[PDB]
Design a binder for this molecule. Structure first.
Ligand SMILES: *C(=C)C1=C(C)[C@@H](Cc2[nH]c(/C=C3N=C(/C=C4\NC(=O)[C@H](C)[C@H]4[C@@H](*)C)C(C)=C\3CCC(=O)O)c(CCC(=O)O)c2C)NC1=O
Ligand SMILES: *C(C)[C@H]1/C(=C/C2=NC(=C\c3[nH]c(C[C@H]4NC(=O)C(C=C)=C4C)c(C)c3CCC(=O)O)/C(CCC(=O)O)=C2C)NC(=O)[C@@H]1C
Ligand SMILES: *[C@@H](C)[C@H]1/C(=C/C2=NC(=C\c3[nH]c(C[C@H]4NC(=O)C(C=C)=C4C)c(C)c3CCC(=O)O)/C(CCC(=O)O)=C2C)NC(=O)[C@@H]1C
Ligand SMILES: *[C@@H](C)[C@H]1/C(=C/C2=NC(=C\c3[nH]c(C[C@H]4NC(=O)C(C=C)=C4C)c(C)c3CCC(=O)O)/C(CCC(=O)O)=C2C)NC(=O)[C@@H]1C
Ligand SMILES: *[C@H](C)[C@H]1/C(=C/C2=NC(=C\c3[nH]c(C[C@H]4NC(=O)C(C=C)=C4C)c(C)c3CCC(=O)O)/C(CCC(=O)O)=C2C)NC(=O)[C@@H]1C
Ligand SMILES: *[C@H](C)[C@H]1/C(=C/C2=NC(=C\c3[nH]c(C[C@H]4NC(=O)C(C=C)=C4C)c(C)c3CCC(=O)O)/C(CCC(=O)O)=C2C)NC(=O)[C@@H]1C
Ligand SMILES: *[C@H](C)[C@H]1/C(=C/C2=NC(=C\c3[nH]c(C[C@H]4NC(=O)C(C=C)=C4C)c(C)c3CCC(=O)O)/C(CCC(=O)O)=C2C)NC(=O)[C@@H]1C
Ligand SMILES: *[C@H](C)[C@H]1/C(=C/C2=NC(=C\c3[nH]c(C[C@H]4NC(=O)C(C=C)=C4C)c(C)c3CCC(=O)O)/C(CCC(=O)O)=C2C)NC(=O)[C@@H]1C
Ligand SMILES: *[C@H](C)[C@H]1/C(=C/C2=NC(=C\c3[nH]c(C[C@H]4NC(=O)C(C=C)=C4C)c(C)c3CCC(=O)O)/C(CCC(=O)O)=C2C)NC(=O)[C@@H]1C
Ligand SMILES: *[C@H](C)[C@H]1/C(=C/C2=NC(=C\c3[nH]c(C[C@H]4NC(=O)C(C=C)=C4C)c(C)c3CCC(=O)O)/C(CCC(=O)O)=C2C)NC(=O)[C@@H]1C
Ligand SMILES: *[C@H](C)[C@H]1/C(=C/C2=NC(=C\c3[nH]c(C[C@H]4NC(=O)C(C=C)=C4C)c(C)c3CCC(=O)O)/C(CCC(=O)O)=C2C)NC(=O)[C@@H]1C
Ligand SMILES: *[C@H](C)[C@H]1/C(=C/C2=NC(=C\c3[nH]c(C[C@H]4NC(=O)C(C=C)=C4C)c(C)c3CCC(=O)O)/C(CCC(=O)O)=C2C)NC(=O)[C@@H]1C
Ligand SMILES: *[C@H](C)[C@H]1/C(=C/C2=NC(=C\c3[nH]c(C[C@H]4NC(=O)C(C=C)=C4C)c(C)c3CCC(=O)O)/C(CCC(=O)O)=C2C)NC(=O)[C@@H]1C
Ligand SMILES: *[C@H](C)[C@H]1/C(=C/C2=NC(=C\c3[nH]c(C[C@H]4NC(=O)C(C=C)=C4C)c(C)c3CCC(=O)O)/C(CCC(=O)O)=C2C)NC(=O)[C@@H]1C
Lengths: 48, 164, 177, 323, 164, 177, 164, 177
């Protein structure tokens, strides 16, 4: 019980940070970012 | 403090009238009922160590978050007060089956209970988890008679409806 | 106010008749089914906090324009007043079920509720829905057919009390309309 | 007499020309108050009958008057219209207070400070402060009896506590506006068989509600609380101080010795001038008239007149650096 | 209108609460008492022409001065009011046995009565002798049953005490 | 009833004198550290529900005979009034810190509190422990030296505002003993 | 008495709450205004005997009929109490400039004045003539600042509106 | 009851919306021209007993049918009760000028005033003339164009306060009628 009580705030804060990144990559993809001619000319920007 | 006797002698005292034939008739109903509630008061007062030990950890098997640090029972002196807080409520149910009304549960267990538990941050849902465990644990021919368990289960959800 | 024992003596007082053994057989049968009435108020007031909160939350989840701004159950002060309004109604029904007639539901609660809710702005058609859920909960509690709660009763029929308490909950809807 | 639905008379504010009577009685004040759970319930117009209502008006508004069967016919008129719906129980205690039965046993038989102290007990169920006394005693000098009773009933304190349908009673609140407002309410309101009738002056609260100091004696406050709050304080411990207090509230001893006016005198053996303490500071009071041939120039030896201890400043004030 | 049911629902409405166990078992005393008082009400209903003519002439057989001129009885109709005035007082005692309280005797027979008979010069002592003749007529296996006659006797001298 | 500006004019009405110039720079210094008085009242009233619960339950843990049958904090009815009694005390010492002197504390709270508590059964030397825990909590908040909540202020020194709020908590214990 | 600070710690006291964030915001406006009215009070305190000997005889220049034998100035010693009455009002104007509201003016100079001046036949029109003169002798760059002359003049015609 | 800042947040509460940068700018101009509002209240409340004695006696010199018997301002008692009636109206207008809207004027002064004067027989058209002279008196003092008294201000335009105070005085006239 003491172990969980010490890590509860650490764990929920790292999950909120991971979902703020997914929301940013989705609005950034629709906002025209990653569509540039320099992004499609790389091989990892073609997979994205 | 709230009985069959005390309501009918306070309704007569408020009008300034004698004990009539109405309130003599109502304490006749205290004669036929006290055969059945004084064996629920007797069965509770010799078995109370077992019934508050198994109702106390029905709270903590439903809410194991209360044993976390910073919560309501986080060390052993706060867990031991929770089993004391449950045993205080089961003793006032025993006083209500002896008095025959909701008198001792009102002025010793329920009045001020919402002020104390909101200030000291105690969950009332984990108080009703211990009381509603013993309401469902009661067997009708095994633990008492039929009408002893009607009176035992009626003072238990008086306590549930005052805390919920 | 008036119970079922004294409703039949204001009828005898209008002709100055002695109430004899002809209309007493209806009233001797009241005390024959007297333990059934006492188990039926006990099954209502034991579940009275769950009956109130389920009724207003079913009124909310069928008309969710009461939670919208400018709705009547909008803020915390108005949702708490609706929960307080709705347990007055369940309190005065269970007096009238315990008495035998509705002479305390009509004088002490319903006398001046229609013109009180109009000056306040309370919607009346949602108030019919909150007491019709409470009517359906009460006839499922005193006939022992609730799905999530079973109470221990003796064996017999109790449908003449379920039709009696449906008439008390329909007098509430006929006054505020 | 007026009309079969009226909520307020006399039109003191403009918003009673549009005001309706309340359909239901008002709720209790929403603070906690652990003493109010040991109290009897509110007598209201909806729940009680007319045997309960006329008894509890006589037990609070009339004190304990012992009203006989023929006497007070004016209250029987105002009760005949209360049952007809012509006036509310807020207006019924306004008709009781302006009646001649309330006048003949509280106005013209008591004192003038003592009349204002009973009106807080009868109409509001507490005791005033000295700033509240001096505004209600100007109305008894400039506007008479009926404008003083009309200031209690039309106050904001009345309509929040009782409203239209609750009989006045002693309200236990929890949080009070001062801590002295609590224990003067309890002192002014004891329980059964009290009857402020031949207690010809109060004289204990008549000098405690004359100072914003002098918090009064705690045995006049442990007495009239509800029991189960004062058991294990009344076996024989504080019990004998209650016995002395009730033998000196009845017969109405004046507190010039112990409570107000407090002069620690010299020892007895340190003077030995005029022998005994019984006749120590006696000097004669002489008053002549000198009108024609009817004088009665009667010298009387007056009692131990004491120092004002308020008119002696002035001294060490009017001559501090001066004189 | 003052029985054991209307004294507990007008005492729980004053505090604003549901019918609890002390209210539910004071109507148990209206179950096991109503076999007696409904028996004694049936004997009063089928004999009320007889028990007013044993009793109503007893005020004239004892207070004989009322049949003199310039008195409370001058003609046959004022005597016929007196057997009518006591038959109302036997109808309301029949109403009190079926309600189970002192309801109809207070609201219809006793309230206002002291400032009626003082105005109309009707002696209350000449009412009581017609009631107190009926009170000692009770023969415990003959007229009604043994426990029926106790509650019949109680409403008769509540009426005597309100007229004394 | 009186603030710090009204204290110096009822001291100078007694001399029939005008409030001149040498009795103003002790009062113009009240205004100059006036923003620190406003931050000190704000750091008391923010975390004030933790203050009256740590003081009462820390008084219980040093005299656990108030929890015994016969103590004055035994039932729920008395513990709810003790936690309410303690936050009247914290309310009136924050009125006296905002105003600058203890005249609303000395009149509306302490005049008659001893005769209230003696007549009601309150142990008057267990109530001084709940006020002296509250004095220790209040001087650790307006000097920012609590170990579990820090607040954010400007740089400087408030050891004279903490020195007079202890002088209002000592006035509660002297009016009760 | 009726300052900024006491009118918010008595509204918090009547509702039963702690000093709010709006209660501290009223004391913030007591900070910025204190430079204006304490230089209007320091100016009045060192100049007080000069301004009452020029506003005192503005009564007697205007209302010269009250130096006749039969009126409020019979002799010399009443006129020295007439300057004493107007030096008391300038002291309370000085006290209400320090405090921050009309506290000392209301409780010590206004309340009771309707009854003392009527029964002793001292005219309220000739008190107003002494206060309306010293309101109009003030010009805002010579005697004080601009806003020091506003709040000195704001407490003067509050006294004139109170006395008339 | 409400002021100009809480009139904004009850409009945003109807839409369940945050009050942000569009209609914050209408409130930042309320605070910026805010010393103009405080001088304009101060000039009303400094000339208030000349202003109510001139508007009531101005109403007499328009219509001298109120000094004949049968008049409503006939008696010595009714002249004091009319000169008190007209300074309640000035007191609630200066609350509404200081606050920023007329919702203290609706709730506390104009509730039931039309029903009062009908039941009293107070003539309606003489009362509108009593508040119209008070309307012309108010806009003269707060634009400083009064003929008999001039007050010292800083220089600038305050005509939108004087167009706001005439909307408050026209609200009193429209509800009496
Ligand atoms: C929201 C969209 C929504 C709801 C909230 C809920 C409201 C609702 N409930 C019923 C019927 C009953 N409710 C009952 C209450 C209880 N059951 C229990 O056992 C506990 C003690 C108590 C509180 C939870 C009961 C007994 C019934 C009757 C059904 C049964 O026999 O069990 C209704 C239907 C009423 C009607 O319209 O006739 C509604 C709307 N339902 C929702 O959809
Ligand atoms: C209908 C509501 C029920 C049901 C009711 C029956 N109850 C019967 C007997 C009985 N009931 C009680 C409970 C009640 N009486 C009290 O005095 C109090 C508390 C003060 C309560 C809550 C008792 C004591 C008894 C015993 C008396 C007896 O058995 O006669 C019963 C049997 C017949 C009858 O008594 O009328 C019935 C049918 N049973 C049901 O199935 C529905 C759900
Ligand atoms: C709520 C947790 C506040 C808070 C309050 C502070 N309490 C401080 C001191 C203190 N607390 C107690 C009670 C505590 N000690 C016990 O032994 C028991 C139980 C048996 C309890 C509940 C005591 C006795 C004291 C000391 C009093 C004294 O010295 O006279 C305190 C100041 C010192 C400190 O920081 O420890 C504060 C600020 N602390 C918080 O952060 C939240 C907001
Ligand atoms: C008190 C003298 C004030 C003051 C007040 C102002 N009165 C203003 C206009 C006004 N006054 C009257 C009443 C007056 N005229 C009469 O004909 C009669 C008698 C029959 C009397 C008593 C009336 C009718 C009006 C005009 C109403 C209107 O225009 O609708 C007024 C505004 C005009 C101006 O600025 O002069 C003011 C300011 N004047 C003062 O300075 C002292 C302080
Ligand atoms: C256990 C299932 C609960 C729980 C209980 C706790 N209760 C605590 C303190 C407490 N409880 C009461 C009410 C109880 N005491 C009585 O004397 C009576 C009636 C005679 C009753 C019903 C009071 C008044 C108090 C406070 C007094 C005290 O401190 O002893 C408690 C301690 C809280 C604390 O330390 O601040 C606990 C932990 N808590 C749980 O985990 C579940 C919810
Ligand atoms: C009786 C034969 C005595 C006697 C009695 C007198 N008692 C008088 C007044 C009185 N008594 C009480 C107490 C009583 N009333 C209650 O309400 C309660 C408890 C709830 C009790 C015990 C009170 C309160 C009062 C004053 C009330 C009133 O004014 O009606 C009394 C009147 C005095 C007088 O007016 O002369 C008498 C004569 N006196 C006797 O000589 C025998 C021994
Ligand atoms: C008798 C010859 C009449 C008659 C009289 C009844 N009046 C009843 C009630 C009642 N009467 C009044 C008016 C009365 N009270 C006053 O204060 C004044 C004047 C100042 C007067 C004239 C009121 C207000 C009430 C209601 C209050 C009350 O007394 O309960 C009445 C009772 C009706 C009932 O319930 O049965 C009667 C019988 N009725 C008649 O038939 C003849 C003509
Ligand atoms: C003037 C000749 C004295 C003096 C008088 C003061 N009396 C003060 C208050 C006061 N006086 C009375 C008694 C009187 N008033 C009544 O209403 C009645 C009859 C019903 C009587 C006999 C009372 C009751 C009170 C208190 C209530 C009130 O304010 O009227 C008083 C005020 C004291 C203060 O608060 O400062 C004064 C100054 N004092 C003197 O120095 C001369 C000798
Ligand atoms: C007979 C034993 C008495 C007696 C009787 C008389 N009663 C007279 C009038 C009367 N009685 C009542 C009370 C009665 N009416 C009721 O409705 C009820 C209860 C439901 C009762 C007990 C009333 C209200 C009245 C007035 C109405 C009327 O006039 O009938 C009466 C006539 C009096 C007269 O005409 O002056 C008589 C003679 N009086 C006796 O002489 C013996 C003692
Ligand atoms: C028991 C005490 C004695 C006894 C007494 C007798 N009663 C006689 C006749 C009788 N009694 C009544 C009253 C009675 N009848 C009722 O209907 C009711 C109430 C419902 C009661 C109390 C009446 C009306 C009559 C007349 C005849 C009749 O209708 O029954 C009686 C015969 C003549 C006489 O002496 O009156 C006697 C001897 N009888 C006993 O055996 C024991 C000793
Ligand atoms: C708790 C730390 C104490 C303690 C406190 C108790 N106080 C009780 C009742 C009570 N307290 C006051 C004073 C309070 N109310 C005010 O209005 C003001 C000042 C403005 C203050 C300081 C009053 C007036 C009352 C009684 C009235 C009422 O409750 O309505 C109390 C209840 C006693 C009981 O019923 O058992 C308690 C327990 N007692 C303690 O043990 C600690 C030391
Ligand atoms: C002592 C308790 C603190 C501390 C306090 C200081 N605060 C200083 C300046 C300052 N404080 C506030 C907060 C306060 N003023 C308000 O008007 C309101 C709300 C209405 C609040 C809550 C403000 C705005 C300011 C700004 C003034 C400025 O900086 O110019 C301060 C600086 C000196 C002074 O201004 O007097 C101090 C020392 N600092 C601490 O370290 C302790 C813990
Ligand atoms: C402003 C309207 C004029 C102006 C006026 C003059 N005032 C003259 C003298 C003077 N003024 C006052 C009142 C003033 N002095 C104070 O100390 C205070 C309060 C703090 C006030 C309101 C007094 C008492 C006197 C007499 C001497 C003095 O104390 O200054 C004055 C001299 C003429 C004379 O001797 O009477 C003038 C011309 N002066 C200006 O510049 C603007 C235009
Ligand atoms: C004068 C310019 C008017 C006029 C005025 C009269 N008003 C009279 C009485 C009155 N006025 C009010 C309303 C007032 N009181 C309040 O408390 C509030 C706001 C909260 C307002 C607006 C009331 C309630 C009353 C009745 C109370 C009382 O009678 O004093 C009045 C007295 C009428 C009379 O008795 O003769 C007068 C003369 N009447 C006029 O003709 C002009 C236009």
């Amino acid at each position: 019980a003491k172990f969980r009580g010490s890590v509860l705030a650490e764990r929920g804060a790292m999950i909120t940070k991971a979902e703020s990144a997914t929301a940013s990559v989705i609005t950034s993809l629709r906002d025209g970012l990653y569509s540039g001619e320099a992004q499609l000319l790389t091989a990892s920007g073609q997979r994205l | 403090m709230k009985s069959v006797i005390t309501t009918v002698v306070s309704a007569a005292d408020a009008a300034g009238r004698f004990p009539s034939n109405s309130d003599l008739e109502s304490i006749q109903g205290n004669i036929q009922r006290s055969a059945a509630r004084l064996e629920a008061a007797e069965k509770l007062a010799g078995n109370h160590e077992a019934v508050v030990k198994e109702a106390g950890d029905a709270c903590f098997a439903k809410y194991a978050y209360l044993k976390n640090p910073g919560e309501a029972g986080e060390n052993q002196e706060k867990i031991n007060k929770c089993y004391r807080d449950v045993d205080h409520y089961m003793r006032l149910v025993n006083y209500c089956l002896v008095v025959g009304g909701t008198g001792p549960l009102d002025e010793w267990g329920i009045a001020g209970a919402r002020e104390v538990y909101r200030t000291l941050n105690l969950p009332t849902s984990a108080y009703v988890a211990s009381i509603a465990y013993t309401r469902d644990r009661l067997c009708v021919p095994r633990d008492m008679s039929a009408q002893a368990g009607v009176e035992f289960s009626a003072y238990l959800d008086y306590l549930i409806n005052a805390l919920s | 106010m008036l119970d079922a024992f004294s409703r039949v003596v204001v009828n005898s007082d209008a002709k100055a008749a002695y109430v004899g053994g002809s209309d007493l057989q209806a009233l001797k049968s009241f005390i024959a089914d007297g333990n059934k009435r006492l188990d039926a108020v006990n099954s209502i007031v034991s579940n009275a906090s769950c009956m109130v909160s389920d009724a207003v939350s079913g009124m909310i989840c069928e008309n969710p324009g009461l939670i919208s701004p400018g709705g009547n159950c909008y803020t915390n002060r108005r949702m708490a007043a609706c929960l307080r309004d709705g347990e007055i109604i369940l309190r005065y029904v269970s007096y009238a079920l315990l008495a035998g007639d509705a002479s305390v539901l009509e004088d002490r609660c319903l006398n001046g509720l229609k013109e009180t809710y109009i000056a306040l702005g309370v919607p009346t058609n949602s108030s019919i829905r909150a007491v019709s859920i409470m009517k359906a909960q009460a006839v499922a509690f005193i006939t022992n057919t609730a799905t999530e709660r079973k109470m221990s009763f003796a064996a017999g029929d109790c449908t003449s009390l379920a039709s009696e308490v449906a008439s008390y909950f329909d007098r509430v809807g006929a006054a505020i309309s | 007499l007026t009309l079969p639905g009226t909520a307020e008379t006399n039109l003191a504010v403009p918003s009673n020309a549009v005001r309706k009577v309340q359909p239901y009685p008002i709720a209790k004040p929403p603070s906690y108050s652990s003493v109010d759970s040991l109290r009897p319930a509110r007598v209201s117009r909806m729940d009680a009958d007319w045997a309960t209502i006329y008894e509890q008006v006589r037990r609070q508004v009339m004190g304990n008057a012992y009203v006989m069967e023929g006497e007070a016919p004016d209250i029987d008129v105002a009760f005949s219209q209360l049952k007809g719906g012509n006036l509310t129980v807020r207006e019924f205690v306004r008709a009781v207070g302006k009646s001649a039965s309330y006048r003949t046993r509280f106005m013209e038989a008591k004192s003038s400070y003592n009349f204002v102290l009973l009106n807080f007990k009868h109409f509001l169920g507490r005791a005033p402060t000295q700033e509240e006394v001096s505004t209600h005693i100007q109305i008894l000098a400039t506007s008479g009896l009926e404008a003083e009773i009309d200031s209690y009933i039309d106050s904001d304190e009345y309509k929040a506590l009782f409203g239209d349908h609750v009989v006045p009673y002693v309200v236990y609140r929890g949080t009070y506006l001062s801590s002295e407002r609590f224990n003067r309410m309890v002192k002014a309101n004891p329980g059964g068989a009290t009857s402020d009738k031949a207690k010809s002056n109060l004289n204990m609260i008549a000098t405690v509600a004359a100072d914003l100091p002098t918090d009064a004696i705690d045995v006049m406050r442990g007495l009239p609380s509800p029991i189960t709050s004062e058991t294990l304080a009344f076996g024989t411990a504080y019990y004998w101080a209650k016995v002395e207090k009730e033998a000196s509230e009845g017969r109405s001893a004046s507190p010039i010795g112990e409570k107000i006016g407090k002069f620690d005198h010299a020892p007895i053996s340190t003077y030995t001038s005029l022998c005994s303490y019984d006749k120590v500071n006696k000097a004669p009071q002489i008053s002549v008239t000198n009108v024609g041939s009817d004088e009665h120039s009667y010298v009387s030896v007056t009692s131990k007149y004491i120092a004002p201890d308020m008119a002696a400043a002035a001294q060490m004030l009017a001559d501090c650096q001066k004189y």
